A paper describes a structure:
Here, we characterize the La-module of LARP1, which plays an important role in regulating synthesis of ribosomal proteins in response to mTOR signaling and mRNA stabilization. We show that unlike other LARPs, the La-module in LARP1 does not contain an RRM domain. The LaM alone is sufficient for binding poly(A) RNA with submicromolar affinity and specificity. Multiple high-resolution crystal structures of the LARP1 LaM domain in complex with poly(A) show that it is highly specific for the RNA 3′-end, and identify LaM residues Q333, Y336 and F348 as the most critical for binding.
Crystallization trials with RNAs between three and eleven nucleotides in length produced seven complex structures, including non-isomorphic structures with the same ligand. The crystals show density only for the 3′-terminal nucleotides and can be classified into two groups based on the stacking of the first and last base. The LaM appears to act as a rigid scaffold and the differences between the structures largely arise from differences in the conformation of the bound RNA. To facilitate comparison of the complexes, the nucleotides are numbered from the 3′-end: A(–1) to A(–4). The position and conformation of the two 3′-adenylates were identical in all the structures while the 5′-nucleotides displayed considerable structural plasticity including two different stacking configurations. Analysis of the nucleic acid backbone angles confirmed the rigidity of 3′-end of poly(A) RNA, which results from tight binding to the LaM domain. The glycosidic angles and sugar puckers for A(–1) and A(–2) were tightly constrained with A(–2) generally showing the smallest spread in structural parameters and lowest B-factors. In contrast, a large range of angles, including syn glycosidic angles and C3′-endo sugar puckers, were observed for A(–3) and A(–4) nucleotides. The structural heterogeneity suggests fewer structural constraints and weaker binding of these nucleotides.
Numbering used by the authors: 322 to 410
Write the structure that this text describes.
């Protein structure tokens, strides 16, 4: 079920970058740079992501077409208004 696996990875990570979650997720926001980017390694270590894959290359594949998040090099951010969310590390 690799297509379903990719969809579950996408939905879980798009949840972390939803406004509903970001409002309260200080740990995640303290890991952003000033552009909102944080390492995909951090996301890949979260328990719900580990429950789907331990292979970070499948995460990149699952997110390739996301309209919520944007991947640059090995980091990911929320696309919309990215500077609203970072917090002092
Ligand atoms: Cl885990």
């Amino acid at each position: 079920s690799q297509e379903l696996l990719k969809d579950y990875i996408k939905r879980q990570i798009e949840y972390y970058f939803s406004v509903d979650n970001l409002e309260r997720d200080f740990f995640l926001r303290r890991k952003m740079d000033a552009d909102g980017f944080l390492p995909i390694t951090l996301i890949a270590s979260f328990h719900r992501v580990q429950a789907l894959t331990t292979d970070i290359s499948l995460i990149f594949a699952a997110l390739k077409d996301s309209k919520v998040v944007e991947i640059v090099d090995e980091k990911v951010r929320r696309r919309e208004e990215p500077e609203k969310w970072p917090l002092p590390p």
